[PDB]
Structures are given as structure tokens and as C-alpha cells.
Design an enzyme around this catalytic site. Sequence first.
Site, PDB file in Angstrom:
ATOM      1  N   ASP A  57       0.800  -1.221   0.000  1.00  0.00           N
ATOM      2  CA  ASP A  57       0.000   0.000   0.000  1.00  0.00           C
ATOM      3  C   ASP A  57       0.838   1.279   0.000  1.00  0.00           C
ATOM      4  OD1 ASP A  57      -1.853   1.962   0.056  1.00  0.00           O
ATOM      5  OD2 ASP A  57      -2.723   1.255   1.987  1.00  0.00           O
ATOM      6  N   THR A  58       0.989   1.852  -1.203  1.00  0.00           N
ATOM      7  CA  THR A  58       1.726   3.098  -1.370  1.00  0.00           C
ATOM      8  C   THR A  58       1.077   4.291  -0.671  1.00  0.00           C
ATOM      9  OG1 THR A  58       0.708   3.606  -3.501  1.00  0.00           O
ATOM     10  CG2 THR A  58       2.727   2.320  -3.517  1.00  0.00           C
ATOM     11  N   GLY A  59      -0.239   4.176  -0.442  1.00  0.00           N
ATOM     12  CA  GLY A  59      -0.939   5.246   0.264  1.00  0.00           C
ATOM     13  C   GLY A  59      -0.838   5.210   1.771  1.00  0.00           C
TER      14      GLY A  59
HETATM   15  C1  LIG Z   1      -3.300   2.147   6.914  1.00  0.00           C
HETATM   16  C2  LIG Z   1      -3.181   3.542   7.445  1.00  0.00           C
HETATM   17  C3  LIG Z   1      -1.799   3.764   7.994  1.00  0.00           C
HETATM   18  C4  LIG Z   1      -4.157   3.824   8.555  1.00  0.00           C
HETATM   19  N1  LIG Z   1      -3.387   4.505   6.380  1.00  0.00           N
HETATM   20  C5  LIG Z   1      -4.517   4.725   5.693  1.00  0.00           C
HETATM   21  O1  LIG Z   1      -5.581   4.090   5.816  1.00  0.00           O
HETATM   22  C6  LIG Z   1      -4.454   5.867   4.641  1.00  0.00           C
HETATM   23  C7  LIG Z   1      -5.279   7.008   5.226  1.00  0.00           C
HETATM   24  C8  LIG Z   1      -5.355   8.190   4.246  1.00  0.00           C
HETATM   25  C9  LIG Z   1      -6.277   9.308   4.729  1.00  0.00           C
HETATM   26  C10 LIG Z   1      -7.740   8.943   4.721  1.00  0.00           C
HETATM   27  C11 LIG Z   1      -8.215   8.554   3.346  1.00  0.00           C
HETATM   28  C12 LIG Z   1      -7.364   7.369   2.919  1.00  0.00           C
HETATM   29  C13 LIG Z   1      -5.901   7.694   2.901  1.00  0.00           C
HETATM   30  C14 LIG Z   1      -5.060   6.535   2.396  1.00  0.00           C
HETATM   31  N2  LIG Z   1      -5.066   5.435   3.352  1.00  0.00           N
HETATM   32  C15 LIG Z   1      -4.417   4.273   2.793  1.00  0.00           C
HETATM   33  C16 LIG Z   1      -5.319   3.476   1.891  1.00  0.00           C
HETATM   34  O2  LIG Z   1      -4.578   2.719   0.932  1.00  0.00           O
HETATM   35  C17 LIG Z   1      -6.291   2.591   2.670  1.00  0.00           C
HETATM   36  C18 LIG Z   1      -5.607   1.359   3.260  1.00  0.00           C
HETATM   37  C19 LIG Z   1      -6.592   0.267   3.653  1.00  0.00           C
HETATM   38  C20 LIG Z   1      -6.874  -0.734   2.764  1.00  0.00           C
HETATM   39  C21 LIG Z   1      -7.787  -1.712   3.054  1.00  0.00           C
HETATM   40  C22 LIG Z   1      -8.373  -1.789   4.273  1.00  0.00           C
HETATM   41  C23 LIG Z   1      -8.145  -0.774   5.173  1.00  0.00           C
HETATM   42  C24 LIG Z   1      -7.213   0.192   4.900  1.00  0.00           C
HETATM   43  N3  LIG Z   1      -7.319   2.219   1.717  1.00  0.00           N
HETATM   44  C25 LIG Z   1      -8.617   2.474   1.971  1.00  0.00           C
HETATM   45  O3  LIG Z   1      -9.044   3.052   2.965  1.00  0.00           O
HETATM   46  C26 LIG Z   1      -9.570   1.975   0.878  1.00  0.00           C
HETATM   47  C27 LIG Z   1     -10.672   2.969   0.649  1.00  0.00           C
HETATM   48  C28 LIG Z   1     -11.574   2.460  -0.419  1.00  0.00           C
HETATM   49  N4  LIG Z   1     -11.133   2.518  -1.620  1.00  0.00           N
HETATM   50  O4  LIG Z   1     -12.703   2.019  -0.185  1.00  0.00           O
HETATM   51  N5  LIG Z   1     -10.162   0.721   1.343  1.00  0.00           N
HETATM   52  C29 LIG Z   1     -10.156  -0.398   0.607  1.00  0.00           C
HETATM   53  O5  LIG Z   1      -9.764  -0.337  -0.571  1.00  0.00           O
HETATM   54  C30 LIG Z   1     -10.700  -1.624   1.244  1.00  0.00           C
HETATM   55  C31 LIG Z   1     -10.467  -2.907   0.756  1.00  0.00           C
HETATM   56  C32 LIG Z   1     -10.992  -4.018   1.431  1.00  0.00           C
HETATM   57  C33 LIG Z   1     -11.813  -3.822   2.539  1.00  0.00           C
HETATM   58  C34 LIG Z   1     -12.362  -4.896   3.220  1.00  0.00           C
HETATM   59  C35 LIG Z   1     -13.175  -4.729   4.304  1.00  0.00           C
HETATM   60  C36 LIG Z   1     -13.387  -3.438   4.742  1.00  0.00           C
HETATM   61  C37 LIG Z   1     -12.825  -2.358   4.108  1.00  0.00           C
HETATM   62  C38 LIG Z   1     -12.021  -2.534   3.008  1.00  0.00           C
HETATM   63  N6  LIG Z   1     -11.476  -1.461   2.357  1.00  0.00           N
END
Ligand SMILES: CC(C)(C)NC(=O)[C@@H]1C[C@@H]2CCCC[C@@H]2CN1C[C@@H](O)[C@H](Cc1ccccc1)NC(=O)[C@H](CC(N)=O)NC(=O)c1ccc2ccccc2n1
Lengths: 99, 99
Positions: free
Chosen positions: A25-27
Site C-alpha cells: 500500500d503506497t498510500g
Molecule cells: C493504513 C493507514 C496507515 C491507517 N493509512 C490509511 O488508511 C491511509 C489514510 C489516508 C487518509 C484517509 C483517506 C485514505 C488515505 C489513504 N489510506 C491508505 C489506503 O490505501 C487505505 C488502506 C486500507 C486498505 C484496506 C483496508 C483498510 C485500509 N485504503 C482504503 O481506505 C480503501 C478505501 C476504499 N477505496 O474504499 N479501502 C479499501 O480499498 C478496502 C479494501 C478491502 C476492505 C475490506 C473490508 C473493509 C474495508 C475494506 N477497504
Amino acid sequence: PQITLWKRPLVTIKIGGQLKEALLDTGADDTVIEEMSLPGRWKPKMIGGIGGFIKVRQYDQIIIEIAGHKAIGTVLVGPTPVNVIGRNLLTQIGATLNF
Amino acid sequence: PQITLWKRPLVTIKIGGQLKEALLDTGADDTVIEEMSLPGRWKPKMIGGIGGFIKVRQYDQIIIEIAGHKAIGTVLVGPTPVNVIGRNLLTQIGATLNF
Ligand SMILES: CC(C)(C)NC(=O)[C@@H]1C[C@@H]2CCCC[C@@H]2CN1C[C@@H](O)[C@H](Cc1ccccc1)NC(=O)[C@H](CC(N)=O)NC(=O)c1ccc2ccccc2n1
Ligand SMILES: [Cl-]
Ligand SMILES: [Cl-]
Ligand SMILES: [Cl-]
Ligand code: NA
Ligand code: NA
């Protein structure tokens, strides 16, 4: 490898002798893994994701293999539906984003 | 380009006539942009991640220029603190993770 993004970039990780799946996860600044025991002491941390902040346990200097590459660094443990490999460990395995 | 991950992979995008900064996010299924108007029809959606879910507006067939590369797809608009370019548009610019 070269990983395309048509599907989630899920890889096998190994931590504590156990295999798990995790997302490259690059984000993500940080690496967050599902509740699990890890050795040593932990420190508090709040992290913010799309739905708000959560409290996690910060464990430093944890040995983790990611897609067969070794890393040793900080792993956050807390409630997440998916284990996330963030940039702190993607840099240790030499990952780049290319287009 | 080749983007290292020592820092957040932020790039310039153009969407709805507007230049913005956004995060290239291989861990996001979806593209989520901070509150703004977009043209056309939309429908409500809930999307989740760490911390829970947020309600968004889903616009289909939206063009976004990402670091100079045009992409079209679904864009979600809602209360995100960061503009996120997810896999649905990263694929269209040919982005890969490499290590
Ligand atoms: C992991 C952490 C350090 C907390 N960082 C982050 O979460 C940062 C926070 C930033 C500010 C808020 C908006 C998002 C950005 C980018 N994110 C990273 C970012 O890559 C984040 C990582 C992630 C992936 C999957 C599950 C949970 C968390 N992705 C997401 O939040 C994306 C949002 C979306 N497209 O619906 N979630 C998902 O793509 C995703 C995939 C599978 C799932 C299964 C069950 C429940 C939820 C699920 N969400
Ligand atoms: Cl680290
Ligand atoms: Cl799409
Ligand atoms: Cl391809
Ligand atoms: Na430790
Ligand atoms: Na539309």
C-alpha cells in the site's frame, strides 16, 4: 516482480513463523496488521484512515518477510479488515511505483 | 516515471477543471476526492477502511488527468482529508509496483 493493479496487490508475509496475506500500500505511511501477539514492549499510537482514527499498538524492530524479502521495522497492531504494508517497509524491500 | 516511496507519492491531478494534489494509492480500491461538485448524475455509496466507513457520492465516467496522463472512471466524492487515486484509475495509466 512487477505487479499490476487490476486486482488488489496482496502478497504473502511471514511474521512470527506464521504466514498471512497483506496489501502492498503506497498510500499508507505505516504498516498495520490484525491483532496478533508480537514480542517485546509496545508504545501507543493513533492512526487515521478513511473512517477516522484508531488506537494501535506500536511494536518496533519486528522481523517480517514480505513476498520473500526481509524487513525489520515498525509494525502497528490493531483492528483492520486487511493487513497493510505501508511505506515504512515498502522502502526496505526496494519497492517503487512506475508508469 | 519511477516514484520512490521515501515520501508520500503525491502528484498533480486535474479534475472538474481544477488542479489538485492527490495520493497514488495502491491500497485503495476506489478513487476518493475531497468535497467538490462534479457534473452529471450520482448515487450514494458507503466505503470503508481503517476507522470505519464514510458516505460518498459516486460519479461515473469522470475524466481525471493524473500526472499528465488522462484516465476515465468512477470517482467518489466525500469527506476524505486527502485526495486518493485508487486502483480503478491507476490501472488506466499503466501503473505498477516493482521490487
Ligand atoms: C493504513 C493507514 C496507515 C491507517 N493509512 C490509511 O488508511 C491511509 C489514510 C489516508 C487518509 C484517509 C483517506 C485514505 C488515505 C489513504 N489510506 C491508505 C489506503 O490505501 C487505505 C488502506 C486500507 C486498505 C484496506 C483496508 C483498510 C485500509 N485504503 C482504503 O481506505 C480503501 C478505501 C476504499 N477505496 O474504499 N479501502 C479499501 O480499498 C478496502 C479494501 C478491502 C476492505 C475490506 C473490508 C473493509 C474495508 C475494506 N477497504
Ligand atoms: Cl520502520
Ligand atoms: Cl472505474
Ligand atoms: Cl496492464
Ligand atoms: Na520491539
Ligand atoms: Na457521470
